[PDB]
Design a protein around this nucleic acid. Structure first.
Ligand SMILES: [Zn+2]
Ligand SMILES: [Zn+2]
Ligand SMILES: [Zn+2]
Ligand SMILES: [Zn+2]
Lengths: 200, 200, 200, 200
DNA sequence: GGGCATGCCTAGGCATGCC
DNA sequence: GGGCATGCCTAGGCATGCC
């Protein structure tokens, strides 16, 4: 169905200098997850690990949370809630934690929460923010996308954005970043195709 | 789910000399329904008209009915009921007569009945047999197939057979014929490919 | 654990001329199921369809059943019950019909029964025998093998035989045949290797 | 299952100047335990003795303990508790002291304790710290690793770190060090392979 | 229709156990 | 200990949708 609103996608580093980082995976045909700096776009396979690094200039307070939400990138689809297709919704692949209709999961976090917003109807997945150890320089979260961009009755070949927000314990906004996502069978092939088309 | 049984597919012309016939459509691009005599296989597009001719040596009694049912061709899948995938099942394309989950519809017949067999769980579509119209030596029935062979969560790229039975009143068997079906985007392309592969 | 007995493996065509047949699949590196006439040995992948044909000279009575049981081929292992390994036993792959510890499953048959013999401790899977369609010449049963021959804590790289018995309603021996089985990742590779080694 | 937390792996020599040392074993393939300074990685065979030296600049107080814990090295697996596979868990190889599911054991110490943390669900093995024997400069602990890195349903080919912590009698941190571990059939072969690949 | 768009299968060859 | 035994991963390439 449709949402009454559209989540802001404006980059906002905020007080803590919140930025995203991504691994340097190349574009081998079927690399599981690869990020394009040129496009600010992640290309990844269904249900595979997608590492996203959280960078901050200073450490946010305890109780700070990290939320991920997908929206359609094209303005005419923006009000449509991004959700899994009827087939994948029904298949038996829930990890015991995630609701069957949620596109975005976090893997390997017992404290994960899945929200179905009563007012906006938007799905999101939230985990507590954890600083890195004083040595290490960033915190990595591992997302799984549970449909292909092409799934009929679902994203139906429409591009999406993932919006990552840093929130305090009440859910107030601390920072925001985003990136485009294509979930597909051949991330390396598809990334090189879209990068080539930039020259066209 | 699974059926307790598998419908017989044995050709049986019976007392009335029941045979099927098909149009001579070629193998072009744009072609919505084309039949391969070499493969005894119909290639057609989703929700497009598929004419099947009923030929008989003599006219069956009034009350005679014509039933169509799909089964998976591969033996290991035979017990699985052929049905629409979750996406097409949910989309809003019912013609007001056909249940949403039935793969096979008859178009242009007010006296069409759709059965969901309580014992076998098989879907089928039945119309009254009408002797041929003045000038024709055959009665034509127009079927529509409402999922592609490739629909995930549905036929999922498994070939099917359509079994056409000539039945009497009680439902007893007067005759039987069958043909393979591929529902696909490019029937002409795919027909020529499979015919070529016959030489391989 | 150990069984008190060892099932006979003697070929016995019996009154009905019971024989097995197998498809002509080649030795492509990772063909899913391929049979070696030279070795009387099936090579197949885990959980993949393995067609076995039942041939008879004349039709056994209604109520006749077909049973499959694995035993270790090497004499010193013969008394050890063939079962799934601890890992596969625990994984969530049951089809709703087969107990988790059974190596051998039948796919696509609602009337399948799984037995855990109270006296011998042997596992077996049984289905009703169904004659061929009026035209057809044999009956095909589709087995799945749910561990690799190499599974540690399970078959642990020991070869097995599958024993197929034709039985009456009561369990009385009507006929018996058998074949060796290797469940492996690359059936074609492994079949060619063992066939080559015959010359060594 | 998953842990709610991830143990810190930051090196911390602390007040007592806590360091690890390892023997100079070469890579004669057969070798049962060999350490790579280039990789800070131990390569060892299942259940074989793995000497780890504890070095300190000054002697920690009586009641000081030494704890070992494994975690997955890859960030996406970090929250998954490292444990033995289902096969090795079930086999009859307990030394009378170690629980069957613990990956890491200490050999030759009657005062060994095995902990299954109620809050984190992590396994660990702890012994009292003993200053070196007179004439020795370090204290050697002998660990055994009870699965191969490749065990299916266990580590499943994922690299692990062993974290060695010096803690006081309350469990408070006095010092910490770590090393990567590969448990495998051919330590010398595999060490040379990974060292060679450093140049690639 | 002719060109893509885009998922699925599999042969090759690497990873890794075994005696 | 070198020679295999054997499962896993994925780039090549086809299957099949789309307009
Ligand atoms: Zn989907
Ligand atoms: Zn469909
Ligand atoms: Zn197994
Ligand atoms: Zn193990």
């Amino acid at each position: 169905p449709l949402s009454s609103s559209v989540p802001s996608q404006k980059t906002y580093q905020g007080s803590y200098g919140f930025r995203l980082g991504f691994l340097h995976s190349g574009t081998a045909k079927s690399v599981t997850c690869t990020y394009s700096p040129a496009l600010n776009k992640m290309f990844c396979q269904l249900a595979k690990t997608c590492p996203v690094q959280l960078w901050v200039d200073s450490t946010p307070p305890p109780g700070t949370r990290v939320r991920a939400m997908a929206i359609y990138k094209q303005s005419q689809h923006m009000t449509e809630v991004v959700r899994r297709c009827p087939h994948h919704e029904r298949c038996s692949d829930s990890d015991g934690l995630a609701p069957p209709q949620h596109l975005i999961r976090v893997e390997g976090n017992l404290r994960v929460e899945y929200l179905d917003d009563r007012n906006t109807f938007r799905h999101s997945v939230v985990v507590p923010y954890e600083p890195p150890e004083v040595g290490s320089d960033c915190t990595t979260i591992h997302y799984n996308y549970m449909c292909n961009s092409s799934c009929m009755g679902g994203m139906n070949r429409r591009p999406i954005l993932t919006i990552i927000t840093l929130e305090d314990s009440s859910g107030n906004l601390l920072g925001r970043n985003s990136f485009e996502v294509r979930v597909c069978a051949c991330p390396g092939r598809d990334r090189r195709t879209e990068e080539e088309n930039l020259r066209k």
